[PDB]
Structure formats: structure tokens, C-alpha cells
Write a protein that binds this DNA or RNA. Structure first.
Lengths: 180, 201, 258, 157
RNA sequence: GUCUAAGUAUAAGCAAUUACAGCGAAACUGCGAAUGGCUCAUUAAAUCAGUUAUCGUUUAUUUGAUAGUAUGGAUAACCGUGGUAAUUCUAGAGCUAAUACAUGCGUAUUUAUUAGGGUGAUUCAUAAUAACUUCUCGAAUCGCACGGCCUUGCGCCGGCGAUGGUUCAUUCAAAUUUCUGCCCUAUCAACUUUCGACGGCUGGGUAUUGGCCAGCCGUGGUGACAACGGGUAAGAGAGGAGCCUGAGAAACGGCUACUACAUCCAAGGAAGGGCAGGCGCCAAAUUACCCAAUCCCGACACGGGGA
């Protein structure tokens, strides 16, 4: 298997080649939402626990939630679900989606970092990635930057900038908007 | 999938007429709501003109009218007594219009004791608790509610026997499958002996 | 058939418009608005055919979109929505207007008319009935709802509104022995003078009419339209709306020709 | 217990009035009503339609079924139904092959009010109402009681 | 398909001099397509033509009247990690907003009671009362001016439109509905009652009237004044079966199974359901150019048109 281990606080995630089906034995049979640690994966990992979320089969099939009896049941999907973009609006297409219980058939898992360990990883926690779009309405700016109600948001700018090359004149300064 | 029209019939002369067209979507007849008592189960069936129709599959309560006073109290439903159409609908106790339902005389009887100052539906043991029956009379309240106590506190005595039962004979005039509720009014007098006489039949 | 289309056919195009038999299949169908199909008269047919003030719809939309033309003071940037009845149409520069009336033959004609005589309107009562608040209000024949009128002003009166709030400044009374336009029957669109009204329990009680030269015709109350008592509010149509014979009126035209 | 019963047990106007006569408005007044109505259209209400305690809802003086415009006449074929007459309206058809007239007879059916006094062979004014069944789209209004005979009797009328 | 200055633009997109703001693809949101026009077993007063009518029914839309009342969670676009052969296959983690789904210290629905200008007449319209609904509405919008009072209050008052909204109109419609007229015929005088054939009470659903349908009985309804049958010499749609949208469709060139074929494959899986052209049952009429006119549709002067 190969892992899309996901890190929300730093915005950073990876794929990881998994040798040792012995390191996959503790990952077998576990339903979604369960928590298996990183110490049974690696000797180089100790303290992380991880939440199983998703991934994809061999030959590309996605994963639904709550779908015990683990084979690829051709599940009927409707609007507003996972693993489904509607062909037309209101359309309820029967697709083929894998069950929850992890057997050996999976190609790439998708994991959630729950508890941080002791070993540094460069490309997962040590490298940094803040989010792109910032707090856009006024009360969202109030709730992040702590502007109790007599403060007039306008001076608080969460701006982005673009400088080109080839020109030549000035930097380019852009503020999103403040609604309400 | 279910038809309504006037052309799938036989003539006034008797010969069946050759149908000249297929079914069009303005001649539809929908499934009847055989409404039962319980939780609140609702289909909203959106009908012609954007006008969504209140389809009541299962119900509990609904306000009834005390006809000799114009009083309306919300009332829980107990059960079907008679229907002139179908003893299969009585036999499954299915609610409908022209169904006489024995009802809770508790909100009616507590408008009676909350307003008048007279007992009905009680045993000859004459037990009594806290005072709201008297709570405080004035001279104006004494002349007022005693002057209303003097004459018009009055009942058909078979209705009084259904205050002792606490479960009166109302009639449903609303339909559930097109209005979302099963409401009616109370049966009084000649209609009381009429449909209690249908309990006799 | 089975729902609305917007395509008008050309052999079945009716009398009031003067459409050509040529130029492809379809004719300028009017869409919804105040009036029905019959007394409708779009600005398409009005400014291009009746006036010859247009070349094609680049020019007509190029007139209509720039906010120069008014209908009751409203902008009306639409081609398919109708113009009304006995109409007041604006050319506000140089101070002129266009009243649509009948001719002496029964079809509509334009008139350049002044700001006052244009700025009031002759609109018939269609209904006086009870609505919300407990008041009998007035549904006009043409566009609007005149709420809180005089409570004895009933149906079939034809009202001088000032067109500005839709309020009765005068009314013409439905009467026997009065002068009325007729819009229906076998003799539609004629100025006449009613001699009698009959009751006709069973639908559409009528009027007997006897004109200036003793011609009688009895037509219904749904098409009668009492246009004036004497009191020349509106512009007079040609020939006083008598609709005489083609030969004698032809000799009168050759007699009055310059 | 006499006309309230009629094998199918509700005979009421759409305005309930009977049990709440004991309410102290209409009874010190006079609002104790069989449901009183005129049909209009140049007629007169019969007296059994004034106070006659039968109850039907397809009655034009008790119920809400009305008349509009079109008024008809005709002679009854079979009076004996469950309150429905059948009209044989004859007319003279103009055959163009013969340049003549002939008889063509027709059959209506009209719901009957228990107000008037019925005959078979009478000449009966009926009226168009809303279609209360397939063939019964009419209602019996005014009887000219005549001694016209059965199928043998003829008049275009 | 579709952008108005008048929805939501932080495109690391143009292009200028810190709330955004000019241009503006992407994406959300809205409208959209009951039709352009197709193929072939037919439809014999059932259609239709007059002609009535809904006091038996709905209407997106049009324009007009309109309402003394009891500072909020997302997600798409975006950023990245990517899975498989992959086809509107799509996953996880993180953003972030709307006129978008949702909150907010009289009226809308249903039941009964009562009062009650028009019409030939209604229990009509209208008003009040008592409650009821798992409560619809009474704007937490956008743009364009920039002002009266001068408490110059990060004031109070202020218009011009765009969008949105309970209720009644109005048009456009759709739906039934009545008196008469089908072409021929007696090798057509009996037919309809199955499990409605005609009434009538009660319901039920239908937008409403209707045996349209179920109890429940009564006895029907028609026809030699030509019923009914027969003779066609005039609507039905890869296919049954169900379903969803909308103001309007039993929508199919839209879903779900089953039935008959058939295409891509890494053989597990997937996407698939037209008329026109040539030859034919030794060769003969263009595979033409345009929405310019007339006309139709969309946020709408542009964008789209097999008339």
C-alpha cells in the first residue's frame, strides 16, 4: 500500500511507500474512524496515532462509509454523497464503491494525523504551509484577530501581493474584501 | 400510473368506447392516505400551480370545536367508533371524514372547570385537590360567574355519561390526505342519540 | 397547442395591424400584458408600420433602450408587451403625443395631441367589487385598480382619470340615450347613440342603438364603450364615427378633396 | 327518525344548525333555519322547499348546486327512479336529401328535488347545473302538470 | 445556452493610482429546453365545428393594487498529495463568500361559531371569534446620487432604480362542460349489467365536478324518430415495469431494475442505445452561401437560431 497521511495543522501531507505487509497486518481489517498508531508501523516512528479515512482500490475505485461485508458492492448513490459527482442534478446513479473493512486489495490509503509522535519528519511536519485564502467576512476577522466590537476592521488587512518580472514598475498589492 | 378520466368506461347506451389517446398528466389520481394514529408521518405532495399538498399519513392530535359555545381546544385522538362507508375502515380504525371518534374530554372538561365552576365526569366519592375552582370571587366575579352558574351550566345527560367516560363522540370534517390534519366538531343531541344508536346497531 | 408558443402565423394574422404577406413565415406576436389579443397594438407595429419611423430592429431597439419613449410615464423597453387602448404615447421633445383611437371604419389610428388632452386618459370600469379591508374598489378595463372610489360609481362608467395616480376626476355614465363606441358584433368599432337597454336574463344584456341617420343595431354590454356625453375630452375621429356608405362617403371625399 | 335516516346516515346542510339551537342568540331571536335559498332566475320557491324537513345536498333550495343562463324544458320518460327523471326532447331534423323534417328524440336525466309534486307525463322545466354525474347535469325546477301519455305521445317542445 | 453599472470576483490574469471597487475567463446562484422539426398501427359526433359555462379548476410570466400588530455553519471554484487502463471515475487534507441552503430579545393553512356591496340567485365577496400547522410572509441584499437639520454627531433624516415577497387582479394559457352536424348500411334488434350498467348517501383522491373509485342498497341506461354491430374510402413513437422536474410533461435524443443486441479493456470493470447521404428493392436535380431581412429565445443593444 501507499499512504496519503494527512496533516491539517500545517497543511501538509504525503504519500508513503509501504514495504512489510507485516507492517500492514495491524492495518488490516480495521473499519473507518478507528485509530492505529505509527509506532507499530515504524521503528523510526513512536507516539503518533492516526485515523483511517479513505483511499482507493487497485483499479481505481473509491471508498464509502458504513459499508461492512467487504467486497466491491455496486452501491446506488444519490445527490450529496461522497465518491460521486452528479452527472445531472437530482441524478441517482448506481456506481461501484468498495466497502469499509481493509483487506489487502487497497492501493493508496488516506489517513488523518491524530496524535503527534517524537520523531521529526521533514516533509510532513517540519516543512510549513499556511493556507491560501484568509478570513473574508468582518465577524470572521473579529473571531480570528480578536477585535471586540468597537474597532473598525478596515485597518486589519490579510493581503496578498503579486510582483511580476519583465515589469518593472512596482509591486502589486491586493486585499480581498470585508463583507458585513 | 393510476388513472382518473371519464373515457375508460362504457357508454350510456352501453357499448365500450375505443380510447383515442394515451394518458396525459392532468388526469391523475393519487393514492389515498389511509391515515393511522401515532407519530407525525408526512408526505408533502407538490400539486398543480406550485401548491404543495399536506399529506398526513400518521397523526396524534388536533383541535376540535365545542359547538354549543364556539370553544376550540387542542385534543388528542383516541379511536374510531363508526363510519357509514366501511367496517373495514372501522375494523382497521382508519381515520377519515364522516368518522365519529371518541375523544379526550380532558381539555374540554378543564375549560368547563376552568370557566364555569361546576363538576362533570367525577365519581360520587367527590374527591378534590387544590383550589382554582373558587380561586377568588369578587362581588363582580361572584355575580358574574354565579350568574352564569345559575342556569346555563347544562349538559345532555348522555354526553354527561361520556364525561364520566371522559371520551366524547366527535366527528371528523377535515381530510388528512389533503389538509395535513384530522379535525372535526363535537356531536350533540339528536345526532348523539343517532350515532350512539349506531353503536346500538 | 399543449402549452404556449411565441410563433405567430401569417395567413391568420388579424385585421388591426396591416402586416405584409411577404418576408418569410412568422409575424410579430404580442406577448402578455394588460389587454387581450384583439385590441392589442405593439410598438413594433406602431412605430415601424403605422408611422414609418423605423428601418429595422437595430434602429427600433436603438430608439427604445435609450429612455426617450414613455408609456404612462413608464420606460417600457420591451417589444412584445402591448400598447393599450385609446392610447397616450409620448414624443416629449417638442411637446407632442399620440392618441390611438378608432377611425370611422373601426381600426386604430395615431394622433398628435397636446400635453393636457394627452395627460388625462379615458379608461373604462371593468369591475367594482369588494376586496381586502372591506372596500369596493374599481378594476379598470385597461390596466389598473382604482382603490377607494366614490362608492356609487359602478361598472360600465368610462372614467377620466388624470393617468397620474389612477383616480377618478370624471366618469361617463352607462345610459340609455347616450353616445357610445361599439367594439364588437357584426358592426364593431362605431360611434353611435344608444336608444334602449334590454335586460336578457340568460347572458349579456344588450342595447338597441339608432344612429344619426336612423340605422338600428342591438349589441351587447361587453362590447359597448360609452365614449362621451358631449364634453369633447378626446380628439374627434374622422367623420364623427358615423360609418356611412362607401359610395356616398366616397362622393363626400371627392367633394371635400382639394 | 323518518327522513334523517335514509339508509346512509347523514342528512345535514353544509351549515350545521340543529344541536346548537340551545345557544342564546338565534333562539331568543329567530335564526332556527332549514336552509333557505332562492334559485333566482325568475322562479318562485315551493313551500316544501321553504320548510320541508327533507335534506339533500343536490337540492337547489337546500344545497349549493346552482343554475346559470341556459334553461330547458321537456317531458319525462321514466319518473320512477331514485329521484331522477329522464327527458325525451324531440326535435324536427331537416333532411336535405328529402328537403323535409323528421322526428329525432333525445334523453336527458335530471336530479329531482323532493319539494314539488311529481307526475309521469308532465312537462318539466329543468336547468343546467354542474355535472353531478355523467348523464345528470341538470336539475328539476318547475312542473307544468299535463296529462300527456307514454311513448305514443309526441310534441316538439 | 446564458452576464445587467445594479448578485457572489484575493484568477500569484490584464490593467491603473489597502475595505473590495476599472476589464474580467473559473466556479457558485438564477432563468432555461412542455418546444425547432422528425418516424408510422391509426384515430368514423369519442375528437372537431359552431355554441354555452365553471356560483366545479390551476397558471411561470405581464402590469396595477398592495402588509398600525404577536453581525451565522458551510462548501464549489482555489492550494496541494494523489489512486486506476480509464471515459461528467474520482479520493483525502486544508481554504473562503453570496439575493445560495439558515437563524431573527398582523398575515398564510385547516376546523367550527357568528356577522354578512354584487348577481337572475349562492353558505358569494368581506369582517370578527376560538384555536390549529411540526408555521409561508412582513428584506442581516445590490447599484446610482450625494444632500435638508445643523445634536459636524466614526449622526439623524434623504431620494433614483435593480433584485426579492403574503394577497387580489390582468394577460398568456391549460382543463373539463353543454343544443345541433359524422360517410354508408339492416347478411345488424337487440345491447350494456365482468368486479358500475344508471341513480343516490357517505367518503377518498384529482387543482376541482364527475361511479373516476370503494362500501351500501335501489333498478337500471338505450334502441326501428334507427341503439348497437359491421364496412375504413381520416393520433402512436431498443421495450415493457416504476420513478423524479416544473407554471405547464406520465418529459424518455434525463435515473432504477428486467428483457434483445452491441462497443473500450491491462478481462476484475465500464461507458451504449438520431435522422439525413450513396448503392439498391451501368450512372443523369448542389455534399452551396447567410441570420442581412421577417420572426423567436435567454442575467440580456452583444450571445444563440436546420423557420
Amino acid at each position: 500500500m501507499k499512504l496519503n497521511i494527512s496533516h491539517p495543522a500545517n497543511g501538509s501531507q504525503k504519500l508513503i511507500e509501504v514495504e512489510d505487509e507485516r507492517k500492514l497486518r495491524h492495518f488490516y481489517d480495521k473499519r473507518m474512524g478507528a485509530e492505529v498508531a505509527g509506532d507499530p508501523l515504524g521503528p523510526e516512528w513512536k507516539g503518533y496515532i492516526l485515523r483511517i479515512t479513505g483511499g482507493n482500490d487497485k483499479q481505481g475505485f473509491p471508498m464509502k462509509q458504513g459499508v461492512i461485508a467487504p467486497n466491491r458492492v455496486r452501491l446506488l448513490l444519490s445527490e450529496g454523497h461522497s465518491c460521486y459527482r452528479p452527472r445531472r442534478d437530482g441524478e441517482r446513479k448506481r456506481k461501484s464503491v468498495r466497502g469499509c473493512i481493509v483487506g489487502p486489495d487497497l492501493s493508496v490509503l488516506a489517513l488523518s494525523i491524530v496524535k503527534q509522535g517524537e520523531q521529526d519528519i521533514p516533509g510532513l511536519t517540519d516543512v510549513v504551509h499556511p493556507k491560501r485564502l484568509g478570513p473574508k467576512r468582518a465577524t470572521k476577522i473579529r473571531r480570528f484577530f480578536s477585535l471586540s466590537k468597537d474597532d473598525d476592521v478596515r485597518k486589519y488587512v490579510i493581503r496578498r501581493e503579486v510582483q511580476p518580472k519583465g515589469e518593472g514598475k512596482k509591486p502589486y498589492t491586493k486585499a480581498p474584501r470585508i463583507q458585513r | 400510473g393510476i388513472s382518473r378520466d371519464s373515457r375508460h368506461k362504457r357508454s350510456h347506451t352501453g357499448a365500450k368506447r375505443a380510447f383515442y389517446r394515451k394518458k396525459r398528466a392532468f388526469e391523475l389520481g393519487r393514492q389515498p392516505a389511509n391515515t393511522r394514529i401515532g407519530p407525525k408521518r408526512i408526505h408533502i405532495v407538490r400539486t398543480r400551480g406550485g401548491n404543495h399538498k399536506y399529506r398526513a399519513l400518521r397523526l396524534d392530535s388536533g383541535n376540535f370545536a365545542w359547538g354549543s359555545e364556539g370553544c376550540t381546544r387542542k385534543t388528542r385522538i383516541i379511536g374510531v367508533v363508526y363510519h357509514p362507508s366501511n367496517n373495514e375502515l372501522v375494523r382497521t380504525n382508519t381515520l377519515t371524514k364522516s368518522a365519529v371518534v371518541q375523544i379526550d374530554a380532558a381539555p374540554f372538561r378543564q375549560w368547563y372547570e376552568a370557566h364555569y365552576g361546576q363538576p362533570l365526569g367525577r365519581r360520587r366519592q367527590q374527591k378534590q385537590g387544590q383550589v382554582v375552582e373558587e380561586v377568588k370571587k369578587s362581588k363582580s366575579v361572584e355575580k358574574k360567574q354565579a350568574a352564569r352558574f345559575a342556569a346555563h351550566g347544562k349538559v345532555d345527560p348522555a354526553l354527561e355519561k361520556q364525561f364520566e367516560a371522559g371520551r366524547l363522540y366527535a366527528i371528523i370534517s377535515s381530510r388528512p390526505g389533503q389538509s395535513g390534519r384530522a379535525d372535526g366538531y363535537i356531536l350533540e343531541g339528536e345526532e348523539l342519540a343517532f350515532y350512539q344508536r349506531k353503536l346500538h346497531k | 397547442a399543449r402549452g404556449p408558443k411565441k410563433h405567430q402565423k401569417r395567413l391568420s394574422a388579424p385585421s388591426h395591424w396591416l402586416l405584409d404577406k411577404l418576408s418569410g413565415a412568422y409575424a410579430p406576436r404580442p406577448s402578455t400584458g394588460p389587454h387581450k389579443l384583439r385590441d392589442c397594438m405593439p410598438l413594433i407595429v406602431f412605430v415601424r408600420n403605422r408611422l414609418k419611423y423605423a428601418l429595422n430592429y437595430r434602429e427600433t431597439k436603438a430608439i427604445m433602450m435609450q429612455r426617450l419613449v414613455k408609456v404612462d410615464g413608464k420606460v417600457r423597453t420591451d417589444i412584445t408587451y402591448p400598447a393599450g387602448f385609446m392610447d397616450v404615447i409620448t414624443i416629449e421633445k417638442t411637446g407632442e403625443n399620440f392618441r390611438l383611437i378608432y377611425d370611422t371604419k373601426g381600426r386604430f389610428t395615431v394622433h398628435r395631441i397636446t400635453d393636457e388632452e394627452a395627460k388625462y386618459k379615458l379608461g373604462k370600469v371593468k369591475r367594482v367589487q369588494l376586496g381586502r379591508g372591506g372596500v369596493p374598489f374599481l378594476v379598470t378595463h385597461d390596466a389598473r385598480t382604482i382603490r377607494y372610489p366614490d362608492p356609487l360609481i359602478k361598472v360600465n362608467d368610462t372614467v377620466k382619470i388624470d393617468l397620474e395616480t389612477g383616480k377618478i376626476t370624471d366618469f361617463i355614465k352607462f345610459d340609455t340615450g347616450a353616445l357610445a363606441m361599439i367594439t364588437g358584433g357584426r358592426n364593431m368599432g362605431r360611434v353611435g347613440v344608444i336608444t334602449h337597454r334590454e335586460r336578457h336574463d340568460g347572458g349579456f344584456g344588450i342595447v338597441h342603438l339608432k344612429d344619426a341617420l336612423d340605422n338600428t343595431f342591438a349589441t351587447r354590454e361587453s362590447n359597448v364603450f360609452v365614449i362621451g356625453s358631449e364634453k369633447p375630452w378626446i380628439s374627434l375621429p374622422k367623420g364623427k364615427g358615423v360609418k356611412l356608405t362607401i359610395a356616398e362617403e366616397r362622393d363626400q371625399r371627392r367633394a371635400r378633396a382639394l | 327518525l323518518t327522513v334523517q335516516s335514509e339508509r346512509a346516515f347523514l342528512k345535514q346542510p353544509h351549515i350545521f344548525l340543529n344541536s346548537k339551537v340551545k345557544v342564546k342568540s338565534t333562539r331568543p331571536g329567530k335564526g332556527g333555519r332549514r336552509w333557505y335559498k332562492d334559485v333566482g332566475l325568475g322562479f318562485k320557491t315551493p313551500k316544501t322547499a321553504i320548510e320541508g324537513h327533507y335534506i339533500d345536498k343536490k337540492c337547489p333550495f337546500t344545497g349549493m348546486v346552482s343554475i346559470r343562463g341556459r334553461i330547458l324544458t321537456g317531458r319525462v320518460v321514466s319518473t320512477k327512479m331514485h329521484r331522477t327523471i329522464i327527458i325525451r326532447r324531440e326535435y324536427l331534423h331537416y333532411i336535405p336529401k328529402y328537403n323535409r323534417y323528421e322526428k329525432r328524440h333525445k334523453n336527458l336525466a335530471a336530479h329531482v328535488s323532493p319539494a314539488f309534486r311529481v307526475e309521469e307525463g308532465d312537462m318539466v322545466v329543468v336547468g343546467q347545473c354542474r355535472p353531478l354525474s355523467k348523464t345528470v347535469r341538470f336539475n328539476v325546477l318547475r312542473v307544468l302538470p299535463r296529462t300527456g301519455k307514454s311513448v305514443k305521445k309526441f310534441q316538439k317542445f
